[PDB]
Amino acid sequence: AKAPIRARKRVRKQVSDGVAHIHASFNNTIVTITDRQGNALGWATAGGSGFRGSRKSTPFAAQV
RNA sequence: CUUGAGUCUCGUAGAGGGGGGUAGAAUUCCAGGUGUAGCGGUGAAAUGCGUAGAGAUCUGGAGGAAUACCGGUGGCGAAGG
């Protein structure tokens, strides 16, 4: 159940808009969000979703 | 003699040969900036590499082969070339 917590107010860089980069290879996909002026705000992968084998290089493991 | 072959200047098509000059782009690398955990490999897998901060990504520099497409049943070289 609910607790009496203070209000949240935090800032990081508030960029509002970005560019994304997709590096597709033969064994994996690497998917990366950045700011438009060019700084990484996070990434994920298809290999870290743990499909492994051929199943690791598919449109669906890449989507997730 | 020309009926074999040879030769002059002219045009034409082409990756024939030797030496010069030249650019950008991924891997790769370095530096700074941003940023967190896999990256790689495969039939499935593990060795490698990585928190000293990798992988990727922004900016800028580095370096060496190579130069795809146009390249086509094309064209060229003495044959491979």
Nearest DNA or RNA nucleotide to A30 (CA to C1'): B56
- Residue A39's nearest CA partner among A16, A18, A11 is A18
A20 exposure class (CB count in 10 Å sphere: 0-12, 13-18, 19+)? exposed
CB A28 within 8 A of CB A56: yes
- Residue A49's nearest CA partner among A61, A31, A33, A32 is A61
Round to whole Å and give the CA distance between A10 and A2. Answer: 21
Helices (runs of H) and strands (runs of E) counted in chain A: 1, 3
Q: Which uninterrupted H or E stretch holds A18?
A: strand A18-24
For A29 and B38, how far is CA from C1' in angstroms? 13
Nucleotides of B under 7 A from a protein CB: 33-45, 54-59
B42 closest protein residue (CA to C1'): A53
B40 closest protein residue (CA to C1'): A27
- Residue A36's nearest CA partner among A22, A14, A18, A12 is A18
Q: Resolution in A, one decimal?
A: 12.1
The residue type found at A46 is A
- Residue A42's nearest CA partner among A15, A58, A20, A16 is A20
- Bridge partners of A46? none
